[PDB]
PDB file of C-alpha atoms and ligand atoms in Angstrom:
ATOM      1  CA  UNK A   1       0.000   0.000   0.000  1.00 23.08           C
ATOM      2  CA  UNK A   2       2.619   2.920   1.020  1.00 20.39           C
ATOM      3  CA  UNK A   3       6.152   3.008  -0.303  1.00 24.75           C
ATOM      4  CA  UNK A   4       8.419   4.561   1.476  1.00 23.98           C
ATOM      5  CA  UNK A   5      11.682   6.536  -0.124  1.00 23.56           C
ATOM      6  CA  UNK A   6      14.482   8.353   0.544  1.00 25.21           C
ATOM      7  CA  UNK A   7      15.005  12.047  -0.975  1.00 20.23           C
ATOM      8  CA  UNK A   8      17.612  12.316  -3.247  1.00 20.72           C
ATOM      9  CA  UNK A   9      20.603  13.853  -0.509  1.00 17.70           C
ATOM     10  CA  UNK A  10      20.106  17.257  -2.487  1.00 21.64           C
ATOM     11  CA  UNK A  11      16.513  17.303  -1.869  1.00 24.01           C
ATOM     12  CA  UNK A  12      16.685  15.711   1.597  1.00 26.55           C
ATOM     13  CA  UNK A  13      20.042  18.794   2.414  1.00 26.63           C
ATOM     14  CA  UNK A  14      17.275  21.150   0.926  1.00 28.11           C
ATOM     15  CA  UNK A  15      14.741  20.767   2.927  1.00 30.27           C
ATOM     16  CA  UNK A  16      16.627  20.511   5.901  1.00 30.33           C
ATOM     17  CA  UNK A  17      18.104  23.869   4.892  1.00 28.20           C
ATOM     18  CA  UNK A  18      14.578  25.279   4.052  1.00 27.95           C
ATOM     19  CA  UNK A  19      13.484  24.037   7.648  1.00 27.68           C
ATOM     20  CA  UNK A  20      15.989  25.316   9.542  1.00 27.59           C
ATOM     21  CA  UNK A  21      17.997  28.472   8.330  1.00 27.88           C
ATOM     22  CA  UNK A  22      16.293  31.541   9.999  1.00 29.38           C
ATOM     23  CA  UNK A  23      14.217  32.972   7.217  1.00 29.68           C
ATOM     24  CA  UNK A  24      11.424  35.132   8.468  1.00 29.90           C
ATOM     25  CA  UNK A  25       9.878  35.515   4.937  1.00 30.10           C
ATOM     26  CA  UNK A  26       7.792  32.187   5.371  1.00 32.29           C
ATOM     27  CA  UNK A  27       4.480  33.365   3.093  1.00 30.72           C
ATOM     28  CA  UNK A  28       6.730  33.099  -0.098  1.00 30.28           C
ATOM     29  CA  UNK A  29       5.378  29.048   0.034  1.00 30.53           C
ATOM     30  CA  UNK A  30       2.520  30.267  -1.193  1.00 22.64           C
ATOM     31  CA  UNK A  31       3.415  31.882  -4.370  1.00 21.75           C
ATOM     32  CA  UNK A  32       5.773  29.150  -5.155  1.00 23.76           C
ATOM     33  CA  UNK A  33       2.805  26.639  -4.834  1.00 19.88           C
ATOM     34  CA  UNK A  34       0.651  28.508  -6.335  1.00 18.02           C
ATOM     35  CA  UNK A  35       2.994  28.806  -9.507  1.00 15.69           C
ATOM     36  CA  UNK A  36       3.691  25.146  -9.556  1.00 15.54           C
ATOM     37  CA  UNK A  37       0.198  24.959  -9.997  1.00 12.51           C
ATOM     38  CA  UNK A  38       0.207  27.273 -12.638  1.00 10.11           C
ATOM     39  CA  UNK A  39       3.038  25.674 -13.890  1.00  8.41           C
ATOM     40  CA  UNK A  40       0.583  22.247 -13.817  1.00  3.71           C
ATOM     41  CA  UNK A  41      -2.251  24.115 -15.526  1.00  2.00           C
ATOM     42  CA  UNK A  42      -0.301  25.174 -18.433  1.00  2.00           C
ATOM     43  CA  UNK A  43       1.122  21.950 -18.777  1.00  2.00           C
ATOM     44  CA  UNK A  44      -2.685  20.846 -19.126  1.00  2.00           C
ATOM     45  CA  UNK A  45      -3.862  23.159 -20.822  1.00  2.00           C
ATOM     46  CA  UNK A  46      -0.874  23.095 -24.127  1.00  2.00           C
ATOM     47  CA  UNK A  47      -1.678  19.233 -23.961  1.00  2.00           C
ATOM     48  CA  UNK A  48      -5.315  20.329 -24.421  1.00  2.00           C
ATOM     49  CA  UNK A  49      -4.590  22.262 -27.305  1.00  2.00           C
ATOM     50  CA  UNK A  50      -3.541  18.949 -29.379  1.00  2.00           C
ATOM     51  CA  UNK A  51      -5.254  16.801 -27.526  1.00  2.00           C
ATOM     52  CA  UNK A  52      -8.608  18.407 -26.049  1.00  2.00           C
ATOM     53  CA  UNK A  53     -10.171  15.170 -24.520  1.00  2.00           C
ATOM     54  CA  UNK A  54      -7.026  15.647 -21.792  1.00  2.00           C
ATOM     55  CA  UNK A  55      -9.416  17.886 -20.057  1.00  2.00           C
ATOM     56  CA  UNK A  56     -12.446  15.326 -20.001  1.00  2.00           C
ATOM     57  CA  UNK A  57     -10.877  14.939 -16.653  1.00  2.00           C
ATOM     58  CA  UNK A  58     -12.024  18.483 -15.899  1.00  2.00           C
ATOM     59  CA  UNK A  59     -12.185  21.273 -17.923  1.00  2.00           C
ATOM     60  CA  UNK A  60     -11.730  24.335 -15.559  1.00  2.00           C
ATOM     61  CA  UNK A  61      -7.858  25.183 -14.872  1.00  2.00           C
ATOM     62  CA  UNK A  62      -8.254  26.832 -11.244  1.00  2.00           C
ATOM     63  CA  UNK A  63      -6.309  27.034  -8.099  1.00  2.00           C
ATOM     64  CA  UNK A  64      -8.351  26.797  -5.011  1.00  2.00           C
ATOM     65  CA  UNK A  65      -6.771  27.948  -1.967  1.00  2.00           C
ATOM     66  CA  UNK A  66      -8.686  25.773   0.350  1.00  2.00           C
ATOM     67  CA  UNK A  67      -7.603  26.769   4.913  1.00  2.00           C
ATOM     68  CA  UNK A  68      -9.184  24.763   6.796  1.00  2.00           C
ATOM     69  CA  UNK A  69      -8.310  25.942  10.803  1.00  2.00           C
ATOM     70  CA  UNK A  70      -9.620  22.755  12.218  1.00  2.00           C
ATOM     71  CA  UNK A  71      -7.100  20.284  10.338  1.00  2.00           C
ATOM     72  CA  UNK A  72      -4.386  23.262  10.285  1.00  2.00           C
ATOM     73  CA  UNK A  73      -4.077  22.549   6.676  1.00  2.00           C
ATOM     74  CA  UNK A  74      -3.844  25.091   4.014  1.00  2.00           C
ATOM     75  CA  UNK A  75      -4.848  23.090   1.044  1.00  2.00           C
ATOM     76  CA  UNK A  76      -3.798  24.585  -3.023  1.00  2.00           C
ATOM     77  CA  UNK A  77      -5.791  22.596  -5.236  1.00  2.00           C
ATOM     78  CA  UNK A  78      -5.614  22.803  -8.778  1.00  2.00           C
ATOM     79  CA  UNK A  79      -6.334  21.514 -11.725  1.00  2.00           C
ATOM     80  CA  UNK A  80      -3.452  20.847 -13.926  1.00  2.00           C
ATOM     81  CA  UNK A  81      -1.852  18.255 -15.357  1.00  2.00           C
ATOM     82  CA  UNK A  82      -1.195  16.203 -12.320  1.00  2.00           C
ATOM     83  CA  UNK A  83       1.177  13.914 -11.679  1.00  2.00           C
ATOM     84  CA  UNK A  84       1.965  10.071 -12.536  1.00  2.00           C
ATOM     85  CA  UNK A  85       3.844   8.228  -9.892  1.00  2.00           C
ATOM     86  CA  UNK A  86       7.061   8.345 -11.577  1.00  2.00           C
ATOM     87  CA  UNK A  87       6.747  12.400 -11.347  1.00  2.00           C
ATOM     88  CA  UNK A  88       6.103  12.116  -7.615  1.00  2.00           C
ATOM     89  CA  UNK A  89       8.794  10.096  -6.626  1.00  2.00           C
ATOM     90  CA  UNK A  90      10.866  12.207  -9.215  1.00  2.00           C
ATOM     91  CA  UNK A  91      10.940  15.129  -6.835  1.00  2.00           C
ATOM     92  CA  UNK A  92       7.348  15.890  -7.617  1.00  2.00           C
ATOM     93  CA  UNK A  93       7.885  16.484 -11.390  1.00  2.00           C
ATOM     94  CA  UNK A  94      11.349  18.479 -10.933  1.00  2.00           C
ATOM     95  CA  UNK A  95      14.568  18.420 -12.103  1.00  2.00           C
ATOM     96  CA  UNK A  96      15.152  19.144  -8.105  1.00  2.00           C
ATOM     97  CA  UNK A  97      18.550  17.715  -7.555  1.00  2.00           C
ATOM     98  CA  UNK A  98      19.925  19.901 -10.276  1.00  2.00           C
ATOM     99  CA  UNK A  99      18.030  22.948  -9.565  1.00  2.00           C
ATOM    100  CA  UNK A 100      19.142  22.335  -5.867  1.00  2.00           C
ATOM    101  CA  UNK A 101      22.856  22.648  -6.841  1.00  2.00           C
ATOM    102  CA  UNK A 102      21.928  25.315  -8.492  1.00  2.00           C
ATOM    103  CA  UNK A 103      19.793  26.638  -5.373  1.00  2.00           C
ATOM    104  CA  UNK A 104      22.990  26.628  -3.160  1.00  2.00           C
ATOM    105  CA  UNK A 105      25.134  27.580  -5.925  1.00  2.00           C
ATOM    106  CA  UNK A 106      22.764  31.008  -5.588  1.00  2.00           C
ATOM    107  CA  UNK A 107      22.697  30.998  -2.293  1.00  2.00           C
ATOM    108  CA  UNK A 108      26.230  31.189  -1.663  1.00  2.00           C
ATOM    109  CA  UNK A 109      26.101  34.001  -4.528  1.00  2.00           C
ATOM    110  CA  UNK A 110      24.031  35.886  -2.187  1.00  2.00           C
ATOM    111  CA  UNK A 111      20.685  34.735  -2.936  1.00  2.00           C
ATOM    112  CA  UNK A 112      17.836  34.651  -0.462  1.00  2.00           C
ATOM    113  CA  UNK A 113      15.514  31.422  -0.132  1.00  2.00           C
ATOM    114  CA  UNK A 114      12.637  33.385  -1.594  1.00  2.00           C
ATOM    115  CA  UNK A 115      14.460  32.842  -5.424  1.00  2.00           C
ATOM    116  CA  UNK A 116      13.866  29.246  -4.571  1.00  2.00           C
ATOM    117  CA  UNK A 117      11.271  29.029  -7.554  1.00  2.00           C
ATOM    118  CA  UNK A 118      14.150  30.306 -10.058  1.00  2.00           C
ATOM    119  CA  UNK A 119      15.771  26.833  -9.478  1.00  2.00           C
ATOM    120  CA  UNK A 120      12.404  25.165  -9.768  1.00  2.00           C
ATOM    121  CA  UNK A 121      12.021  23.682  -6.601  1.00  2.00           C
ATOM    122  CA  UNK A 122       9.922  26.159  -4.907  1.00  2.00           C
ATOM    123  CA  UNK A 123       7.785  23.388  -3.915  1.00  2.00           C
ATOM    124  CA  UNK A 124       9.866  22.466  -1.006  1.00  2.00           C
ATOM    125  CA  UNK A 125       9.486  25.779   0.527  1.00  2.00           C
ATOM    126  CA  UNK A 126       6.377  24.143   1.443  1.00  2.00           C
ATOM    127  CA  UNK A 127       8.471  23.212   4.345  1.00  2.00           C
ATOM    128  CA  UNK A 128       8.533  26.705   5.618  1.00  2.00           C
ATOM    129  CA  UNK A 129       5.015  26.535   6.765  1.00  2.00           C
ATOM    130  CA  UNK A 130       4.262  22.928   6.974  1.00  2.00           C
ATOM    131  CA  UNK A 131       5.793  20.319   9.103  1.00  2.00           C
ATOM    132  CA  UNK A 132       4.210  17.471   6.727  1.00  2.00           C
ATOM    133  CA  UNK A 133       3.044  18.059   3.069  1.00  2.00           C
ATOM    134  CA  UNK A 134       0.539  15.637   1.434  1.00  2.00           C
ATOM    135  CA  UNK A 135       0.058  16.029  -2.165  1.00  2.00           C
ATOM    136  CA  UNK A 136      -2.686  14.355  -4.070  1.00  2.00           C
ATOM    137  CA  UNK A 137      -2.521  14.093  -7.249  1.00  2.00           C
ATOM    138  CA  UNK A 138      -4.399  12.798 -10.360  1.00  2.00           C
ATOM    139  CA  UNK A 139      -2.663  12.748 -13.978  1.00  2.00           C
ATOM    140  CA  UNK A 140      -4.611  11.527 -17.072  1.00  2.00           C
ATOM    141  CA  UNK A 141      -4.587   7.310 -17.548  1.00  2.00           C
ATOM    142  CA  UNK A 142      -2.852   7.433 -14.103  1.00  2.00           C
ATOM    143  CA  UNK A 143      -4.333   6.232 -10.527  1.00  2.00           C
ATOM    144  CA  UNK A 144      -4.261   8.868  -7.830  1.00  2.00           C
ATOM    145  CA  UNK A 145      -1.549   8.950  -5.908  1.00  2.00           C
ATOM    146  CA  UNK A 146      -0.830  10.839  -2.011  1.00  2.00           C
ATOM    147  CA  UNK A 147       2.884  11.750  -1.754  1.00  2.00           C
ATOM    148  CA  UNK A 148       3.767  12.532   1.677  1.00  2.00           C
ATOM    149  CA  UNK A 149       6.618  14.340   3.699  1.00  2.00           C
ATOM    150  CA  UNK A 150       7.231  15.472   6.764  1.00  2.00           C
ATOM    151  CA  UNK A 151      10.894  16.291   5.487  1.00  2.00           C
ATOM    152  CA  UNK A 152      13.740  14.242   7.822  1.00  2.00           C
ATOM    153  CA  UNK A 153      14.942  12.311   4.529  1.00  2.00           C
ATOM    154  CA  UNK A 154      12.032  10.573   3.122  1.00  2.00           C
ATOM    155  CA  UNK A 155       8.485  10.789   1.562  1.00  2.00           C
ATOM    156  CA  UNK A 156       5.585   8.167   1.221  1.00  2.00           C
ATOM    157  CA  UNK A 157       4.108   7.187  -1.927  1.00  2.00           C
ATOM    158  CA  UNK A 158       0.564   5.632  -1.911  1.00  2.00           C
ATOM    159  CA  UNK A 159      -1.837   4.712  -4.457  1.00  2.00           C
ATOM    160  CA  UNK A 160      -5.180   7.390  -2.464  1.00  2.00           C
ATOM    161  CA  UNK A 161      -8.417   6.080  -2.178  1.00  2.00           C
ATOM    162  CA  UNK A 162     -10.299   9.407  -1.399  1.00  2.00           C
ATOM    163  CA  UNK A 163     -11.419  11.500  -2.875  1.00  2.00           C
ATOM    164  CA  UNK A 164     -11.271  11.389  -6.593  1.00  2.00           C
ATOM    165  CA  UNK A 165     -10.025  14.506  -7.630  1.00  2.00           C
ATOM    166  CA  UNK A 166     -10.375  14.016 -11.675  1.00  2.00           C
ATOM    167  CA  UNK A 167      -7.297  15.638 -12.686  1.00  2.00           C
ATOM    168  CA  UNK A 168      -4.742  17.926 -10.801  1.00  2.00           C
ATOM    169  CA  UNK A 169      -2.720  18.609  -7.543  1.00  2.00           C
ATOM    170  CA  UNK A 170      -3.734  18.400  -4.262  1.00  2.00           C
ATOM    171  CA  UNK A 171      -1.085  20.172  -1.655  1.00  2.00           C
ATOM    172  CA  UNK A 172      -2.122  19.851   1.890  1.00  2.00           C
ATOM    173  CA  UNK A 173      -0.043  21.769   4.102  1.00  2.00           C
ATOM    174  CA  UNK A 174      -0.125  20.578   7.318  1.00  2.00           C
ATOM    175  CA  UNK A 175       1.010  24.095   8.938  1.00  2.00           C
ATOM    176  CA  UNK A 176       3.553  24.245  12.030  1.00  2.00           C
ATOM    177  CA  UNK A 177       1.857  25.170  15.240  1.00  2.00           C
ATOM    178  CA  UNK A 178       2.762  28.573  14.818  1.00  2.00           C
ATOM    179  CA  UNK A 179       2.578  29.129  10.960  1.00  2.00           C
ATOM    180  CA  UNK A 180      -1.669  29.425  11.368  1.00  2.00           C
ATOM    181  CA  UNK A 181      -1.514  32.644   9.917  1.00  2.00           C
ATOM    182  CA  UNK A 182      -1.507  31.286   6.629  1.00  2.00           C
ATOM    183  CA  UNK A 183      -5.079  30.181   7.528  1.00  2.00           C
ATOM    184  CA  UNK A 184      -6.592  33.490   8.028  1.00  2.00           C
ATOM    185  CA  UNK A 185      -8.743  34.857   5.030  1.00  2.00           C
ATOM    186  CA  UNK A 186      -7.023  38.187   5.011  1.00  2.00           C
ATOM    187  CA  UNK A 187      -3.063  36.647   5.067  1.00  2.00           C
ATOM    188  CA  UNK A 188      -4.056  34.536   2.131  1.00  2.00           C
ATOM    189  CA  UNK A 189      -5.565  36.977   0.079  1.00  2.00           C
ATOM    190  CA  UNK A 190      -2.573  39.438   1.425  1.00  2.00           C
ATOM    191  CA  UNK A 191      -0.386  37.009  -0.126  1.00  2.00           C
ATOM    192  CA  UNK A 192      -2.094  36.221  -2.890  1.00  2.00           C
ATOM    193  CA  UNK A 193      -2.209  39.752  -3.788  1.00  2.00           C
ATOM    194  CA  UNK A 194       1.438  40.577  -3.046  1.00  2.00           C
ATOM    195  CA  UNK A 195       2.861  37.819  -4.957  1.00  2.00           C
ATOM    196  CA  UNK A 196       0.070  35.951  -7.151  1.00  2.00           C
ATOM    197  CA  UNK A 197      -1.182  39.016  -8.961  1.00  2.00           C
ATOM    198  CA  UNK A 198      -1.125  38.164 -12.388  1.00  2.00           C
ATOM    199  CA  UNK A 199      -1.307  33.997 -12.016  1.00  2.00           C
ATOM    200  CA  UNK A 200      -3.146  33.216 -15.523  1.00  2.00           C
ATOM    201  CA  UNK A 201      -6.083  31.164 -13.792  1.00  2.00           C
ATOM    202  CA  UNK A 202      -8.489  31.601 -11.396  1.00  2.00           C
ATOM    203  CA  UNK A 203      -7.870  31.404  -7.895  1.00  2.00           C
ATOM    204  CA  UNK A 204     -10.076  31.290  -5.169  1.00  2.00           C
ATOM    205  CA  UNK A 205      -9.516  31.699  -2.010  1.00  2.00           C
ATOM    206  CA  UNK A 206     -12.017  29.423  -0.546  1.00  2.00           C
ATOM    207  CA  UNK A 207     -13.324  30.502   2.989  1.00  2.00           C
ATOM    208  CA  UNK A 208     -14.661  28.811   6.237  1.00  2.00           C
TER     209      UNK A 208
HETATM  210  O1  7FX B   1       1.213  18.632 -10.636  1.00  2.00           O
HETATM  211  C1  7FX B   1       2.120  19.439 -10.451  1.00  2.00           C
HETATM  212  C2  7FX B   1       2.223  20.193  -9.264  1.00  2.00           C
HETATM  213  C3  7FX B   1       3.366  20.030  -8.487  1.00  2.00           C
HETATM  214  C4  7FX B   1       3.534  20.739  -7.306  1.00  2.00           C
HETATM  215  C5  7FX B   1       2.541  21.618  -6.906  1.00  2.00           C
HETATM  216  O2  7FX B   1       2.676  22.327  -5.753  1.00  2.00           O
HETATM  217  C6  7FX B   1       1.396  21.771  -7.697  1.00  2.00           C
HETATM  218  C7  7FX B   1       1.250  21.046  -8.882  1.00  2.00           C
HETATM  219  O3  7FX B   1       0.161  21.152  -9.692  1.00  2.00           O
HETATM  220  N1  7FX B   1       3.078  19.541 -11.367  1.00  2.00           N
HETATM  221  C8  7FX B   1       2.971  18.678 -12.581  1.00  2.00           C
HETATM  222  C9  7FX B   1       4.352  18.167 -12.967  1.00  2.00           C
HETATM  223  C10 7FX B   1       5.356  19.311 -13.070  1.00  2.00           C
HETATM  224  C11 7FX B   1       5.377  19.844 -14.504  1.00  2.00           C
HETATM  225  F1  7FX B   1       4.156  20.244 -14.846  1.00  2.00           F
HETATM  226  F2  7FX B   1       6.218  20.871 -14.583  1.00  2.00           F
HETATM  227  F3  7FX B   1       5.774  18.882 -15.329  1.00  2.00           F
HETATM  228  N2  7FX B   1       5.071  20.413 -12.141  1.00  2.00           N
HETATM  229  N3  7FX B   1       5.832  21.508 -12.023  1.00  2.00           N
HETATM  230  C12 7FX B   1       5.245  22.303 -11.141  1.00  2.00           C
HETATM  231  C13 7FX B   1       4.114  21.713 -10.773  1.00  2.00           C
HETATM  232  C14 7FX B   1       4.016  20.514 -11.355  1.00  2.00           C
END
């Protein structure tokens, strides 16, 4: 039922880094999750242009920004291309080892951890909210998978028996204790604003 694997020692030095250098700039998870998921959509939506039954799974491309305050879980949901297993195990459909090197290359070049989207593994700055990330996903003439991390070297892979989802991405951040800001309407939409102006699809900030 659940496979368990290691990160890649980039990935796994990555995280750790994103989870433990001082970095007060936390909301920037946010905007790199919510441009993964834009990233997702376009992916869907070029297939769609050759190929328009891809979006039989769903035709709306949206991001649904989805707190809920009694799980602690801020939830981005959208509808994109998804994600076979092999992408999920493969850092989430990243060339993240790479763009890791690349990621401390920058750093040490002076670089704050809120370029960590340039070396396309903003994803992982999930981690600066979230002590464990669960990511459904559902990719076209694939099964839905759950990834899961709580960082500390290694993520679960499972084949997910709730809720279908039809196509997308599914990234439920189970917030840190003190990270519940990122709950509250106004911080989202705050955030949202600040950094995730101009995103090319809907997004809705759902509310509770
Ligand atoms: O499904 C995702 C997805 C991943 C993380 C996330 O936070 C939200 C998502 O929709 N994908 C799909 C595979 C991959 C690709 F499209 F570039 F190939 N990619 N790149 C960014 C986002 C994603």
């Amino acid at each position: 039922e659940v496979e368990t694997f290691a990160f890649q020692a980039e990935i796994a030095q990555l995280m750790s880094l994103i989870i433990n250098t001082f970095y007060s700039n936390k909301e920037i998870f946010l905007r790199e999750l919510i441009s993964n998921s834009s990233d997702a959509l376009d992916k869907i939506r070029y297939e769609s242009l050759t190929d328009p039954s891809k979006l039989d799974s769903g035709k709306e491309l949206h991001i649904n920004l989805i707190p809920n305050k009694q799980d602690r879980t801020l939830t981005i949901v959208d509808t994109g291309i998804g994600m076979t297993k092999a992408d999920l195990i493969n850092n989430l459909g990243t060339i993240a080892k790479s763009g890791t090197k690349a990621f401390m290359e920058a750093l040490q070049a002076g670089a704050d951890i809120s370029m960590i989207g340039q070396f396309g593994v903003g994803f992982y700055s999930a981690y600066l909210v979230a002590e464990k990330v669960t990511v459904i996903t559902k990719h076209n003439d694939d099964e839905q998978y759950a990834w899961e991390s709580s960082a500390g070297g290694s993520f679960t892979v499972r084949t997910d028996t709730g809720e279908p989802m039809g196509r997308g991405t599914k990234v439920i951040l189970h917030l840190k204790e003190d990270q519940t800001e990122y709950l509250e309407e106004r911080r989202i939409k705050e955030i949202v604003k600040k950094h995730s102006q101009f995103i090319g699809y809907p997004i809705t900030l759902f509310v509770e």
